Structures are given as C-alpha cells and as structure tokens.
Amino acid sequence: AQKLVFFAAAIIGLMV
Ligand code: NA
Structure with missing residues (x-):
C-alpha cells in the first residue's frame, strides 16, 4: 500500500 495524508x-x- 501507499501513504496518503489528509487533514x-x-x-x-x-x-x-
Ligand atoms: Na473535518
């Protein structure tokens, strides 16, 4: 998998 950043x-x- 891959890292996804959000607020x-x-x-x-x-x-x-
Ligand atoms: Na929010």
Missing part, C-alpha cells in the same frame, strides 16, 4: 484536528498519515 481532519490532526494531520493524518493514512495507509491506503
């Missing part, structure tokens, strides 16, 4: 607070490093 929701927190800056989140999600593994997709």
Whole structure:
C-alpha cells in the first residue's frame, strides 16, 4: 500500500 495524508484536528498519515 501507499501513504496518503489528509487533514481532519490532526494531520493524518493514512495507509491506503
Ligand atoms: Na473535518
């Protein structure tokens, strides 16, 4: 998988 970053607070490093 690959890391995807987004904002929701927190800056989140999600593994997709
Ligand atoms: Na939000």
